[PDB]
Each structure stands twice: as structure tokens, then as C-alpha cells.
Chains A and B, each alone.
Chain A
Amino acid sequence: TFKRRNGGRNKHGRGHVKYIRCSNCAKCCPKDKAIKRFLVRNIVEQAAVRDVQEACVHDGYVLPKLYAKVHHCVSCAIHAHIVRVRSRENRRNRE
């Protein structure tokens, strides 16, 4: 049986897509198949923002954010709850 119509990856009109290394285990997974998330997270969470905001010398200092684009293989993404097993019908939902 064929689980998905796209074969589990986003490849049409190509023959080959370069792979990437999983951020957790370093497994080689093609770029169009890996689970890619762009995380824009703060330098410190809100319980500890103010005791740094009061220790800023400059007025108007904005604490940077860290930006990282994290790839996961299917196994690590499933195990880390980034993606979940869905039902047959809700598998088709790309939203």
C-alpha cells in the first residue's frame, strides 16, 4: 500500500535533492523530506527578562533574538513530538 501521494517528500520534476544532516543524530535525510523549523527565540525567557532589562546600561537596549533553522530526520521529529502520527484523513492536511 502507498501511504502518501507525495511519497513522503516534496520532489516533482527533479531527479536528485541534496541531503542534510539531522540536528539531533546527524542522519542523512534529503532536504525536501526533512522536518524544517525556523526558531526565532529570545535570549532569555520572560521570567528572567526584567532582571536583565534593569541591568541594561543603555536606555532602549533591545535584547537580541537567536534565529536558527533546525532540520530533523523523520525519526527524531516523531520522537521529539515535533510532528505526530495523525489519522488517515488528517494526514492530507498541509495547514
Chain B
Amino acid sequence: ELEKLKHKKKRLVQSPNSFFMDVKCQGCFNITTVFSHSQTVVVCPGCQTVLCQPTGGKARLTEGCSFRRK
């Protein structure tokens, strides 16, 4: 079906395009829940690594930081 291409509000039942994701850096393999369109520079409490970047759209993760939609 072609609703996935339609605008966020113009679908038969409106739904968001964003997601929360479980993200993992390299130096501290804990898992942090972060939002695909962040708006903030976020650092994991343990390792103190900068974790994602605010953009105009979905946040830009940093080098080698795995994530899973969830």
C-alpha cells in the first residue's frame, strides 16, 4: 500500500513518522533510549560520549553507534 509515501497527516488514520531507538556506543555497552528527531545534544550518563546531533530532521548519530528501532 502507498500510504507510507503520503504526508503524516493525510493518511486515512494519521500516524507519526518518528521513532524511539535503543542506541549503543562503543566504550560503554549500555543502551540509551533516544528520539529520532532529537533537538538536543545528548550524552550517555556513563561514558560521557556525545551521542547524537540535532539537525532539521532526524538526529545524526555519531561514529559507530548502533541503534535499533523499538
Are any A and B Cβ atoms less than 8 Å apart in their complex?
no
